[PDB]
């Protein structure tokens, strides 16, 4: 149950943060994402694990208001979905 909850949360929040961080993307740069650590989704998996476990290394964090909302939701949902079966 715990591994299923973690996998679902990680996938959903990784996709959400990757799409949120691209709203504030600068149009000038040719690449889709240049100023954000969330250049793709697997990086989102790593960040989602680190953020749901309330670890918070700080190597990668959202830098956009939408990203900040997604990050707050990720932290809260991680606390809940970890405190369910433990």
Binding interface with other proteins (CB under 8 A): 11, 18, 30-32, 39-42
The response to whether 51 counts as a known ligand-binding position is no
The response to whether 56 counts as a known ligand-binding position is yes
Smallest gap, in angstroms, from Cβ of residue 85 to other proteins? 23
The response to whether 78 counts as a known ligand-binding position is no
Tell me the DSSP string of 13-69. Answer: HHHHHHHHTTTT--SSSSSS-SS-S-SSHHHHHHHHHHHHTT---SSS---SHHHHH
Residues in contact with ligand PCF by the rule CB under 6 A = 24, 63-65, 68-69, 72
């Amino acid at each position: 149950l715990l591994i299923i909850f973690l996998a679902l949360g990680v996938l959903i929040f990784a996709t959400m943060i990757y799409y949120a961080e691209r709203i504030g993307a600068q149009p000038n740069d040719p690449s889709a994402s240049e100023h954000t650590h969330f250049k793709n989704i697997p990086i989102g998996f790593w960040w989602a694990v680190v953020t749901m476990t309330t670890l918070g290394y700080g190597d990668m964090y959202p830098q956009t208001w939408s990203g900040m909302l997604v990050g707050a939701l990720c932290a809260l949902a991680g606390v809940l979905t970890i405190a369910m079966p433990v």
